[PDB]
Every structure is written in structure tokens, then in C-alpha cells.
Amino acid sequence: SGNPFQANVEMKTFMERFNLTHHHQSGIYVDLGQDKEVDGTLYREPAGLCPIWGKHIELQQPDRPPYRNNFLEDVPTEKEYKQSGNPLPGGFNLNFVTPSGQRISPFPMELLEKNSNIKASTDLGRCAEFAFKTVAMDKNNKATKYRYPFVYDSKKRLCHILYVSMQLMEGKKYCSVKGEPPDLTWYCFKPRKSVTENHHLIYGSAYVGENPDAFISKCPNQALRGYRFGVWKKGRCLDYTELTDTVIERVESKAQCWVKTFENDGVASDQPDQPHSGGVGRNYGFYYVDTTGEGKCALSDQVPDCLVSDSAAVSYTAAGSLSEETPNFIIPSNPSVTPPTPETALQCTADKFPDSFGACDVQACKRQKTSCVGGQIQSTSVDCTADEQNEC
Amino acid sequence: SASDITQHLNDSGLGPAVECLENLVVGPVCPAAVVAPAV
Ligand SMILES: *[C@@H]1O[C@H](CO)[C@@H](O)[C@H](O)[C@H]1NC(C)=O
Ligand SMILES: *[C@H]1O[C@H](CO)[C@H](O)[C@H](O)[C@H]1NC(C)=O
């Protein structure tokens, strides 16, 4: 014990944002965590409480008009479907309108940020809240508790409600790839994160809108620069590369690792059988440079409870963004309610923060070293004393 | 073999056929034209 990343309330609060099992509580790759009854029938419903940065649904429609291969396109009318022929054209976007003909989706952020029914402190929160305050009506025109997921486009500042809650469909038995086989209604599609594309798209269930300010402090929205995720054992912080169940893969770039934390086969998924991952899975990872200078990605399902300092490393989660920097569309205007930055949470001053060494871990013959450098907490493992090395 | 596909669709998150959604900001909303039922 003596984990400096659990030493106090603030620190714990900071480290708890990385526990997706606790805060997100649902699938990430595919989120279908809840079940809701509509007109006597049960349906699966996305339920995750954290926004998923960069997540989009890649479609596999034919590369000809009228197909656009863009899940933010309106869902097709029966007429359009008849006109195109198989597979379904269009996308996942809700195309419903008011009696006067006003779209509910996409919905401009300017109309939300000064509205009465919207109390969220950030644009993303406002989109989420907009989604949460949208429910399906049943046959008797009574309100259900079935809600639709959303996508916030932060570049265009547009909030999308998705009529389609499906996130993955594969297999020639169920769907076609570029129109093959032509007998099938559905095109194949899957969740993706891209090294370059669609970083501005944020996917979420409606329920991140239930408490639309929470995600700001309870979710790991941004990548963590200069540290490796680790687990605290035998008096020291073991970064994932020291654990046996950890998956280590070669990468050309840190973005690839960021993508891998979301796309690897062990990530929390509710895809079929109706599994509820509850947010458990290989959701955590980091990019690091090995001793030879090659880029590596370490992936783990162990919830991090400590950090190992490494300036070239970057720690990612399946839920978070590639970028380390906090964008303005999740910063409240009131400074007094913003959460501590990583720099603040991990701050120290050398004259108040002593260099310390932990007891020797004889199994690895290493010990914790915790110190203050550049006004930030350094956490590493170093050699045991010459005296201690006899016990190794 | 066709019920199985249906079941797979339901298991994959295929939603209910609804005519109307209620939104607190803009009120009730409906499709102006019939949506493709397979969606
Ligand atoms: C993460 O959260 C889950 C659910 O609350 C909990 O069981 C688990 O112990 C937590 N792991 C940590 C804090 O490392
Ligand atoms: C949060 O950020 C704001 C600026 O957006 C202020 O700097 C505020 O002091 C910060 N508070 C915390 C908890 O770090």
C-alpha cells in the first residue's frame, strides 16, 4: 500500500474517471445495456453513461448513387427503398418532423444553448440532454421509456438522434457488402474509430443526458499524456506491460493504439443471446516507445488505479478521444464548476513532496520510486537496494 | 431460419415500429412519409 494515486479524495476522484465499469456501465464497442417494453414487446436499448469520442458506424453500401455510405444520412422512406432496390439506402438519422415540418434531427446547437428545457452546461451535454428528453410513443400514443442514441457533430455543431440503435451487423447470412449478395435487405455495418477521420463525432446513448453535466468529471474524455496506466500491487505500480494477461501489439503511431483500445476483440460489447458487458472488457491501453525505439500498444481490461510516468507514453480508453487537450464544447462557462485538469490533479511542489522508495518487490526485484519533477508526480519502478537484491 | 434472422435482428438492437416520438423541446414528431418498415 501507500499508492500515491489513492492518497486523497481529489486524487481518487481523478483516478476514478478511468473506471468505465463504474461510470459508463455498459458496452462501448456495441452498447445495448438496457431492455425496454414497447407495445408488449421487449427491445434492446443503449444505456452507457459516457460519451464515446470518435465512434462512428461504418456502412458497406454499394459505391453508386443513391448510396452515400454515411450513417448520419436520414433513414430511407419506403419509396426511396423501392426506388433504390436492395440494400436499404440512407443512414441511421431520425427523419421525423413537427406538424409544421421542422426536423428534430439534425438539430442546431444555437437553438439549444439558450432554451428553457435545456439546462446542461456544455454543448455536448446539451445534445445529450436533447436526446434524453426524446422518447418513443406507443400505439395508444402513450410515452414509453425507450430512448434513442445520439451523435454530436462538434465541428458542424449539430446534434443527431439516431432512429437505428443497431451498431454491428455482419455475415452474408444477415447482410450484404457493397450489394453482395443482392437478395438481402441490410447492408453490413460496424463501429469504427479512425486515425484521421470523424474525431469530431461523439456517439452516446440517451442516458449520458440523464445527468448531462456528470460526464465532465466522471468520464475519461481525453487521452492522458506522459503516463502509462497501471495497477497497484505489492507496494508498487505495475504498468500493463508487466502483467501477463496484457496484450502487446506493434503500431506505427499512437493513433493506431488509440483506435486499438476501441477496436480490439476484448473491448466491452453487448453484441450477441443478449450479453450485458456492464462495461467490463479490454478497454484500457497505452502507446509507448520500447527500448529499441519502436512504437508499441499495451492493452488491458484491468481498471487502472495507478500511473507510471513516461513522457513519450500516452494512455487511452475505448471511450475517450485521441487528443490530450480539452475542447471548448465540454468546458462550462463558469470556471468554478470545471473539474481539475490532469496537470492540477497530479501537481506537486518539490519542497512539500518528498522522494520516496517503496519496499522491494522480490518477485521482480524492483521497487516503487515516487517523486516530484517539473511540478508533477513521477511514479516509476527502480532497482532494489544491493542489500535487498540478495532476497530476490 | 427466417425466425432466427428476425431474432438475430432483435438481439442486435432492431427497434420498435413507432409512428411518433415525443420531444420536450419541439413536442411530438412524426415521419412525413412512410419509413421503410425493415429499418
Ligand atoms: C471499478 O468499478 C467497479 C464497479 O463499481 C468496481 O467493482 C471495481 O472494484 C472498480 N475498480 C477499481 C476502482 O479499480
Ligand atoms: C477548471 O477550469 C477552469 C477554466 O475552464 C478554471 O481554471 C478552474 O479553476 C478549474 N478548476 C479545477 C477544479 O481545476
Numbering used by the authors:
A (entry chain A): 68 to 339, 360 to 479
B (entry chain B): 1259 to 1297
The article reads:
Supporting these invasion events are binary complexes formed between the apical membrane antigen (AMA) and rhoptry neck protein 2 (RON2) families that anchor the junction between parasite and host cell. Specifically, RON2s are transmembrane proteins secreted by apicomplexans into the host cell, integrated into the outer membrane, and presented on the host cell surface to serve as ligands for AMA proteins on the parasite surface. Toxoplasma gondii AMA1 adopts a stacked three domain architecture, with Domain I (DI) membrane distal and Domain III (DIII) membrane proximal. The apical surface is comprised of several loops from DI framing an apical groove, and a single extended loop from DII (DII loop) that packs against the side of DI and is stabilized by three tryptophan anchors buried into pockets on the TgAMA1 apical surface.
Most strikingly, EtRON2D3 bound approximately 275 fold tighter to TgAMA1ΔDIIloop (8.0 nM or greater) relative to TgAMA1 (2.2 μM). The 2.20 Å resolution crystal structure of TgAMA1ΔDIIloop in complex with EtRON2D3 showed clear electron density for the peptide seated in the apical groove. Three complexes in the asymmetric unit showed little variation in overall structure (TgAMA1ΔDIIloop: 0.32/0.60 Å rmsd over 392/387 Cα, chain A compared to C/E; EtRON2D3: 0.23/0.32 Å rmsd over 39/39 Cα, chain B compared to D/F), although an O-linked glycosylation on Thr425 of the DII-DIII linker was modelled only in chain A. Since EtRON2D3 chain D showed the lowest thermal motion, the TgAMA1ΔDIIloop chain C complex with EtRON2D3 chain D was used for further analyses unless otherwise noted. EtRON2D3 bound throughout the apical groove of TgAMA1ΔDIIloop in the expected conformation based on previous AMA1-RON2 co-structures, with the EtRON2D3 N-terminal helix seated in the area exposed by the absence of the TgAMA1 DII loop, followed by a length of ordered coil, a beta-hairpin loop, and ordered C-terminal coil that extends back through the apical groove. In contrast to previously characterized AMA1-RON2 complexes, the electron density surrounding the cysteine residues of EtRON2D3 (Cys1278 and Cys1288) revealed a population with only a partially formed disulfide bond. While the second cysteine (Cys1288) was appropriately positioned to form the disulfide, density based refinement of the occupancy for the first cysteine (Cys1278) showed 41 to 74% oriented away from the central axis of the disulfide bond (inset). An initial comparison of the TgAMA1-TgRON2D3 and TgAMA1ΔDIIloop-EtRON2D3 interfaces revealed similar overall buried surface areas (~3400 Å2 for each complex), but an overlay of the TgRON2D3 peptide on the TgAMA1ΔDIIloop-EtRON2D3 complex shows key areas of divergence. Most importantly, the N-terminal helix adopts a different angle between the two peptides, the coil leading up to the first cysteine is restructured, and the tip of the cystine loop is shifted.
